[PDB]
Design a protein around this nucleic acid. Structure first.
Lengths: 207, 118, 120, 113, 53
RNA sequence: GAUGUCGGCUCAUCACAUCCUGGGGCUGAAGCCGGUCCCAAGGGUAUGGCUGUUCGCCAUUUAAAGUGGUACGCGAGCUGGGUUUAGAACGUCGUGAGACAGUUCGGUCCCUAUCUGCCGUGGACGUUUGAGAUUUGAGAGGGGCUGCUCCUAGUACGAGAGGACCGGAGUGGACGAACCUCUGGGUUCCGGUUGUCACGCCAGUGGCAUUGCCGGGUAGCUAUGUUCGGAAAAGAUAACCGCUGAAAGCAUCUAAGCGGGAAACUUGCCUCAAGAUGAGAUCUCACUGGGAACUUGAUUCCCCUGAAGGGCCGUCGAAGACUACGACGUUGAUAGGCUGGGUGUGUAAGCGUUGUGAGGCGUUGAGCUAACCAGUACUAAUGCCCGUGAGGCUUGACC
RNA sequence: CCUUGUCGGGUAAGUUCCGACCUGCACGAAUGGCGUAACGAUGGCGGCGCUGUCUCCACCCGAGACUCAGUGAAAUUGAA
RNA sequence: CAGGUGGUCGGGUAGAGAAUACCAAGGCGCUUGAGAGAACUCGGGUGAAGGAACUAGGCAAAAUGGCACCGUAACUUCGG
RNA sequence: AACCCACUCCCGUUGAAAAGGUAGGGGAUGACUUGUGGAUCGGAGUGAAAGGCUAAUCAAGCUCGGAGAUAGCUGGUUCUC
């Protein structure tokens, strides 16, 4: 099970020895439990976890009745986590305190999104020359396929289009500090997204 | 790509674009109502208001700073004497923009710009 | 130095004045060489008499560069001019006296010789 | 406000007030051979504050016939001391025009006594 | 490049099926009973029940 | 009644008759190295000098610098050095025009994409009453490389020289993804200055000269920077190694029975994924009016009724070609302004002085400050249209 | 022609270049033979300065491409 | 219809100058506009560390550039 | 520099243009450039010679006649049983 945070910025802290540790600061709202999916109706075994503060005009009556089976009184977003074996009942604030120092973690965000990218930026695709007789084609792609005998272009090719706001995870980062008073996790490394994004922090898969 | 970049080009070079917003302001402080184009009004409201904020403090150094960005005698005379004193207790937000139909020849959406008390 | 055909002088007494990089040793195609790496030089311009004659394949270590070295801090040392120190067949230096400063980052298993003659 | 509030706790005062165009002397910690010691590094300051944005400066020393310059992080636990031996007027905050000049041409002028 | 066969009546009319129109922003002025576009100045110069021009 | 020929660049895909790494019979294999042959296609597979060259010969590397198919891959993707029409000259042959599967200098590479093929991205409808939100995963992709040290241990091995297997610990290279805290790079913010025209003149300043030419530089974007990754393990096997054991009194890894077995295979890790027409699953919300015709899953019309919701519209966005997505509309901090900071730049003008003057000094860390942070209603975010009225019939379980 | 003949120089490495040998398949004296200062938008090599040519591209400024209103072609086509 | 067309006039400030930069007299805003600020194409600006490693070939770009004085090689038809 | 000419690169090729443009180049008091008016013509002129030019046409123009030239060669040849 993990915690849903929010990317806030990159800083740098010092060991008193002399080295610097690049640190990504993550704010954690305490996460309420919306419901608990047992294995008998649903097959699988999971929880629903919610971060707060959405205005009470934007919730539909389908949702507003859904956050009244438990008294969650919820805000933006509803995420789910698949867990092995645990017991969470009605509404229970899952806080930062699951983690300790050390503790290899996985962090999933989206990314910053670049609009419609050519093959050089998208696929790292070295281009033709600039002088020495070259026509209009200075950084176009090269050729696509072979001649007559397949006749077609072959699925999976590497053309160009839309660098991603796709969902990307970085894996096996480590926690530098856990702050329960200001609700922070400090993570040594890069965290996918823009500042002010949304971030999920799981304990590590490989470990 | 323009992530978090502010200001729009309007398909004019930068010396044109400087000398056009200097000229839409200097005609607004004569007639106090202008029928202009809608993206040219959204960027007029970031040039004209540091002239009205500046007018609230009379100085030889301010009347030279005012002349050096709206270069006209009549617009400097119209500030510091009428405006700046009329808006002496207004914390910002000196104009308003009212969308008004479309141009006949193109479809350029129009807008009015109008001083707020008049 | 940091690329093939990079002119760089030496920091040594017995050697020649200027040498030129021809091959960056190490991996499959290392493209750059920082401070503390083995390159292979040709001798391009010799003193009227030293020890090393003009036009000879030798082996050198890189000791100063204008791009800098970067420690575990933000703090970097950045010289001006590039500089190498020639080696023998075995990697031990040829000359006696090293000119100018070096860095402390070079001192290792095999290079306690030149940091003795260094003064830094 | 939250990374602006963490960054008040790493900052505990170590440095005096100084400008570009000054001849500082810097005492840095040297950990080698299982013994810590200091080392003096004296030159002329050419780049100043928030150079990334968390406060790093730069100082140019003329070594044994060879130039060298060194960029220091201010609130590091390596930059220990900082004294100011001389100061003058430069007018032009960044002195990168001294990576070319070398001798009597690179004399920092003295309007300021 | 040019085509190799011409396009029939079907494949010509299928192309222009996505090209229709829309105008939906009409609104009645509360005071004068005049019809105009939503969030625009009415042609007699009234915006939300106030003469502006 | 035209299928544009050699080499280079760009981009590739398959074969295995394997160059490297992985498993392994035999050796004229002491050890380190090897030679040779079976199994294996997962990832890799050099920069240069000289030539039009592929090829080659050299210099220096490396774990290794593989051999083929794909019109001897690839000109509606590039080049035009080679063969290359018209010019001109050499050597040879012909009395001559001229020629040579001999040399040498010069010489125009055309196209706006209709059909798959596609790589990205939406509209329509469907999923058997309609919505909002969260999900199982059938299936398909992405990835997969390796060196050098050090401990084991100068031990086994060997006259000596020389020197390991198995296991462990480090930190480099080539490739990839993310990300700006750092180290740098980057035009509209602040200075210096040259020619000239102007604002009535002096001061001050503003046009044009490629941003006039330059010094610096916030946000964003970025690599040459920063961090992370390639597994561990489990199954079923290949070559091979067997254990019991007959047929064939013995022998025999096989006929029955029972195991060990490699980067290949199937999971394992990251992503999309119910248009998976087999259209799945949970939770929660909405709607409980008549009448007539003709024919009764009843169909059709008339009238009242329009809910859950959604869409148009507006302010915008580290979302964007258009769309789509996301946040918000007075229940109000969505964008602009305003007030304090922060950052940058480098001590304004005006006055007062000093001097014959340009200048210095007090003026003085001054003034100005885009994209950043915090607060604040000062200006701008004011109805209408879609969508209805309890959800078919057969069987079984069922009061 | 055989041929990248052989020898020396220049480069870490030179089928081109420079200097010689002469074994001229097939040089040679007004279809001139060998030298030659100055001149070439002339052919071939080598060097200093210099650089986005290039390792390897990153960012900014204009005019198009994209969206909206007005006008509105072309080659091609047996039928889909 | 970015092409072609003989001859006179030709001010000011800098400059040797009818070159070049800003202006007077006089004349014009080039008969489709508005947006937004993707790839890619064209005409441009700056660049870390290297400095021909690119390529048939330093093609192209960058650099050099004024006036006064000092100073100047082999070679030669005695001018250069 | 005007002026005449056309050495290189890129753009253009359905061009703005049936041969230009923007940057750079060569000559620039003479074997120069050019305005007006005249002379030379089709197996015939002119030519510092390339088979070049003679009205966007040139190893012998353009136009009207001989002339419905000749084609063992291509293409086509129409209502039923």
């Amino acid at each position: 099970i993990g915690v849903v945070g929010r990317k806030c910025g990159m800083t740098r802290i010092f060991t008193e020895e002399g080295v610097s540790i690049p640190v990504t600061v993550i704010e954690v709202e305490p996460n309420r439990v919306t419901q608990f999916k047992t294995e008998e109706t649903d097959g699988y075994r999971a929880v629903q976890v919610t971060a707060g503060e959405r205005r009470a005009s934007r919730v539909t009556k389908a949702q507003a009745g859904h956050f009244a089976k438990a008294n969650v009184a919820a805000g933006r977003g509803v995420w789910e986590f698949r867990l092995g074996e645990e017991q969470y009942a009605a509404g229970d604030q899952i806080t930062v305190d699951l983690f300790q120092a050390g503790q290899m973690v996985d962090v999933t965000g989206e990314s910053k999104g670049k609009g419609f990218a050519g093959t050089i930026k998208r696929w790292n695709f070295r281009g033709q020359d600039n002088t020495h007789g070259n026509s209009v084609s200075h950084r176009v792609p090269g050729s696509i396929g072979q001649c007559q005998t397949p006749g077609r272009v072959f699925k999976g090719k590497k053309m160009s289009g839309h660098l991603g706001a796709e969902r990307v995870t970085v894996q096996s980062l480590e926690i530098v500090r856990v702050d329960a008073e200001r609700n922070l996790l400090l993570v040594k490394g890069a965290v996918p997204g823009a500042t002010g994004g949304d971030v999920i922090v799981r304990p590590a898969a490989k470990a | 790509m323009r992530h978090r970049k502010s200001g729009r080009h309007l398909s004019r070079t930068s010396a044109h674009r400087k000398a056009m917003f200097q000229n839409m302001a200097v005609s607004l402080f004569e007639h106090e109502l202008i029928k202009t184009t809608l993206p040219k009004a959204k960027e007029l409201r970031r040039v004209a208001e540091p002239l009205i904020t500046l007018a609230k403090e009379d100085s030889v150094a301010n009347r030279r700073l005012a002349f050096d960005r709206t270069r006209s005698k009549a617009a400097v005379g119209k500030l510091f004497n009428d405006l700046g004193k009329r808006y002496a207790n207004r914390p910002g937000g000196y104009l308003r923009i009212l969308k008004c139909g479309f141009r006949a020849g193109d479809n350029a959406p129009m807008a009015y710009v109008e001083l707020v008390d008049r | 130095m940091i690329q093939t055909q990079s002119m760089l002088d030496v920091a040594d007494n017995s050697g020649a004045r200027r040498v030129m990089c021809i091959k960056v040793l190490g991996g499959s195609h290392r493209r750059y060489a920082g401070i503390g790496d083995i390159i292979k030089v040709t001798v391009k311009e010799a003193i009227p008499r030293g020890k090393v004659k003009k036009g000879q394949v030798m082996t050198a270590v890189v000791v100063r560069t204008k791009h800098g070295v970067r420690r575990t801090d933000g703090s970097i040392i950045r010289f001006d001019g590039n500089a190498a120190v020639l080696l023998n067949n075995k990697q031990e230096p040829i000359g006696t006296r090293i000119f100018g400063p070096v860095t402390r980052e070079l001192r290792t298993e095999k290079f306690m010789k030149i940091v003795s003659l260094a003064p830094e | 406000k939250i990374i602006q509030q963490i960054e008040a706790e790493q900052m505990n005062k170590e440095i005096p007030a100084f400008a570009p165009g000054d001849t500082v002397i810097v005492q840095v910690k040297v950990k080698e051979g299982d013994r810590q010691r200091l080392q003096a590094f004296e030159g002329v300051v050419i780049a100043k504050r928030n150079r990334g944005l968390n406060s790093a400066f730069t100082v140019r020393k003329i070594s044994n016939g060879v130039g060298v310059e060194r960029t220091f992080q201010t609130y590091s636990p390596i930059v220990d001391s900082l004294s100011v031996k001389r100061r003058g007027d430069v007018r032009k905050a960044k002195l990168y025009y001294l990576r070319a000049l070398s001798g009597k041409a690179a004399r920092i002028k003295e309007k300021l006594v | 490049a040019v085509q190799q066969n011409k396009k029939s009546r079907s494949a010509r009319d299928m192309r222009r099926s996505h090209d229709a129109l829309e105008s939906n922003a009409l609104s009645v002025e509360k005071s004068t009973g005049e019809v105009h576009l939503r969030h625009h100045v009415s042609p007699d110069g009234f915006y939300r029940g106030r003469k502006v021009v």
